[PDB]
Design a protein around this ligand. Structure first.
Ligand SMILES: O=C(O)c1ccc(Cc2coc3cc(O)ccc23)cc1
Lengths: 9, 264
């Protein structure tokens, strides 16, 4: 399962 | 002058740096004026500088703003840099789902840091594992990146620029939220992330759906706290006091115990 960051901004 | 007081290093727009006055490790964060959402006064400065000053003190749970400079097209923020560090996102990626004892210690430290923010009149609005640094030798956590924050108020918020997968369902559905209850939701996402190895929701339908599936073995006590923080109705969520009085949150490790047991 692909764990990834999530940009905010 | 900025270039004289610090030795600027390579990238980490944040750069490694050393304060020439005493060889102190610093992080040098550059923020372009054209991309700045909200401004405040202290002297017109980015809201991020206002919030960082209000939380700067002896409490080691939030990142300390050491200095700042204004340039024609940008502001430069001199932040403290602990060493050695890893952010909580990379920590969870490498180690997977954390033991509940470790998650308890980490989560408790985040709660104390967020309470510090609120006590200083500051709402972070972007609590997530990416925005948490782990002092690997002292076992102390630091909340970073106030770039999405606002002054804490008790009235409704209608703007938001934090991380959507940590944002609450009242923001998804109605584009409105209150500060503390939205914060508790993001802490529910963070706690699940700690004990399961990744966040529970990726899509808006999951955020508003109201069902939490546990992909890892998690104690009934911890599951209950997570589900309470992730209540769909904001008023059904626990206060910070109820979180820290919850049965799962008892007998927390000290930061140095946490480092000796889990980090060294
Ligand atoms: O925006 C802020 O407030 C902020 C940004 C950066 C740091 C310094 C830092 C040192 O090592 C790191 C490793 C990381 O994975 C992430 C950040 C850092 C501190 C604060």
């Amino acid at each position: 399962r692909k764990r990834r960051r999530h940009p905010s901004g | 002058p900025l270039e004289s007081q610090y030795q600027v290093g390579p990238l980490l727009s944040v750069y490694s740096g050393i304060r020439v006055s005493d060889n102190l490790p610093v992080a040098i964060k550059h923020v372009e004026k054209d991309r700045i959402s909200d401004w405040g006064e202290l002297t017109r400065v980015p809201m991020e500088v206002v919030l960082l000053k209000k939380v700067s003190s002896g409490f080691s749970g939030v990142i300390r703003l050491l200095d700042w400079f204004e340039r024609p097209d940008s502001f430069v923020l001199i932040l403290e840099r602990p060493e050695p560090v890893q952010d909580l996102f990379d920590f969870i990626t490498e180690r997977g789902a954390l033991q509940e004892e470790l998650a308890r210690s980490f989560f408790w430290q985040v709660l104390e840091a967020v309470r510090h923010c609120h006590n200083c009149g500051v709402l972070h609005r972007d609590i997530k594992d990416e925005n948490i640094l782990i002092d690997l030798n002292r076992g102390e956590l630091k909340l970073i990146d106030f770039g999405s924050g606002a002054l804490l108020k008790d009235t409704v918020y209608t703007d938001f620029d934090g991380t959507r997968v940590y944002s609450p369902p009242e923001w998804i559905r109605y584009h409105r939220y209150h500060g503390r209850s939205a914060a508790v939701w993001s802490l529910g996402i963070l706690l699940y992330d700690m004990v399961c190895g990744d966040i529970p929701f990726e899509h808006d339908e999951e955020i508003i759906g109201g069902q939490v599936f546990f992909r890892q073995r998690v104690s009934s006590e911890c599951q209950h706290l997570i589900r309470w923080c992730l209540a769909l109705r904001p008023s059904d969520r626990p206060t910070f006091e109820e979180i820290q009085n919850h049965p799962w949150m008892q007998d927390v490790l000290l930061p140095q115990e946490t480092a000796e047991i889990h980090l060294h």
